[PDB]
């Protein structure tokens, strides 16, 4: 996260870390057995880390759980990043408490201007690379579809939204992918892609979770 602040330990109880011997993506807990993340974070060997603040120190409150399976959206397109969503089933059910809790799915899409909380352990630099130990947070509005499309003409599908600041200085960055975008208590977005980090007129692009609620529900029911 570039331009954000320290969240505070366990204040984003639905944030997960995907680990393969290092932190490579984020994700959100949506029930005791399932995490949502981005299709592009897809790899074998994933250990889901819940209740993490400092990802380098065991502090207490962590639960380390192997993914049992990862489900990339069948229509995911790695050139376009259209349908950039993935579900991960935990080998066993997390223990839900105040530190480790699930985020609700929206029942309707958010409008332009809604303020959301984005969070991750990704690079905190616009230029160069500086990874934090602790979770960082950012408040960012959802931009209008007109602005989003005039920033990335021919690249925005109806399953993507833009959020952030046209002025540069504040954004998600390398490391943050798969992580939540939460707006009024629901998960509206997934960190997906952009152009550099916190560059002027190049806001971050997010997966539009409201378009996937049925798919999520349907796939979880059958697995
Ligand atoms: N919000 C941004 N400005 N982003 C752009 C820079 C980093 C991104 C997180 C990352 C995963 O952690 N997503 C990307 O790597 C997805 N993707 C892959 C291909 C190239 C494309 N653009 S470039 O890396 O900035 C991209 O965003 C999001
Ligand atoms: Ca830790």
Curated annotation (Swiss-Prot):
It is found in: Secreted, Extracellular space. It comes from Bos taurus (Bovine). GO terms for molecular function: endopeptidase activity; metal ion binding; serine-type endopeptidase activity; serpin family protein binding. This is Serine protease 1. Belongs to the peptidase S1 family. The keyword Calcium applies. Keywords: Calcium, Digestion, Disulfide bond, Hydrolase, Metal-binding, Protease, Secreted, Serine protease, Signal, Zymogen. Synthesized in the acinar cells of the pancreas. Substrate binds at residues 171-172, 174-175, 177.
């Amino acid at each position: 996260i570039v331009g954000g602040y320290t969240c505070g330990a366990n204040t984003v109880p639905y944030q997960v870390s995907l680990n393969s011997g290092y932190h490579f993506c984020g994700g959100s807990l949506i029930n005791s057995q399932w995490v949502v993340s981005a299709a592009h974070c897809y790899k074998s060997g994933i250990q889901v880390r819940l209740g993490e603040d400092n990802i380098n120190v065991v502090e207490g409150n962590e639960q380390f759980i192997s993914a049992s399976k990862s489900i990339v959206h069948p229509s995911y397109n790695s050139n376009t990043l259209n349908n950039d969503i993935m579900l991960i089933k935990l080998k066993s059910a997390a223990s839900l408490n105040s530190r480790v809790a699930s985020i609700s799915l929206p029942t309707s899409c958010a409008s332009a201007g809604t303020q959301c909380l984005i969070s991750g352990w990704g690079n905190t630099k616009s230029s160069g690379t500086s990874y934090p130990d602790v979770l960082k947070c950012l408040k960012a509005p959802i931009l209008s579809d007109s602005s989003c499309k005039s920033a990335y003409p021919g690249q925005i599908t109806s399953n993507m939204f833009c959020a952030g600041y046209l002025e540069g200085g504040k954004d998600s960055c390398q490391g943050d992918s798969g992580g939540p975008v939460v707006c009024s208590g629901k998960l509206q977005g997934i960190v997906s892609w952009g152009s550099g980090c916190a560059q002027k007129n190049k806001p971050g692009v997010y997966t539009k979770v409201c378009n996937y609620v049925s798919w999520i529900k349907q796939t979880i029911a059958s697995n």
